[PDB]
From Swiss-Prot:
Transmembrane segments: none
Organism: Bothrops jararacussu (Jararacussu)
Subcellular compartments: Secreted
Pfam families: Phospholip_A2_1
Protein name, entry field: Acidic phospholipase A2 BthA-1
Something else known: This enzyme has been found to be not myotoxic, not cytotoxic, not hemorrhagic and not lethal.
Length: 122
């Protein structure tokens, strides 16, 4: 669920991470539009497309199984649809970490009005 995605982000990126990442660029959140602004936003674009591949279960709402030990995230569980959701979230979080050095606060709470161009499709 997105609740869990936030908890994951906070664990991997730190306490400021939910607010830092879940309005950023054109795609960090869900249901973004336009062109990804940078690599972090591309993490979010892929995450949104990842959720779009989850057909069995609701990636926004449904609760998955995951571990948080020594600073990282491993997905688990024996419901493969929920694990698929978890992996979308985990991947995104690792992508955020990998791209932290190009995080630009210009894109923090950027706003849909700055993304009104043609959307890149999944």
């Amino acid at each position: 669920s997105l609740w869990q995605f936030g908890k994951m982000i906070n664990y991997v990126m730190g306490e400021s991470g939910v607010l830092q990442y879940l309005s950023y660029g054109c795609y960090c959140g869900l249901g973004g539009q336009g062109q990804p602004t940078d690599a972090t936003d591309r993490c979010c674009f892929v995450h949104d497309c990842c959720y779009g591949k989850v057909t069995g279960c609701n990636p926004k709402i449904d609760s998955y199984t995951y571990s948080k030990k020594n600073g990282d995230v491993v997905c688990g569980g024996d419901n493969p649809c929920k694990k698929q959701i978890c992996e979308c979230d985990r991947v995104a979080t690792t992508c955020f970490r990998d791209n932290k050095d190009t995080y630009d606060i210009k894109y923090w709470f950027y706003g849909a009005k700055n993304c009104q161009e043609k959307s890149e499709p999944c």
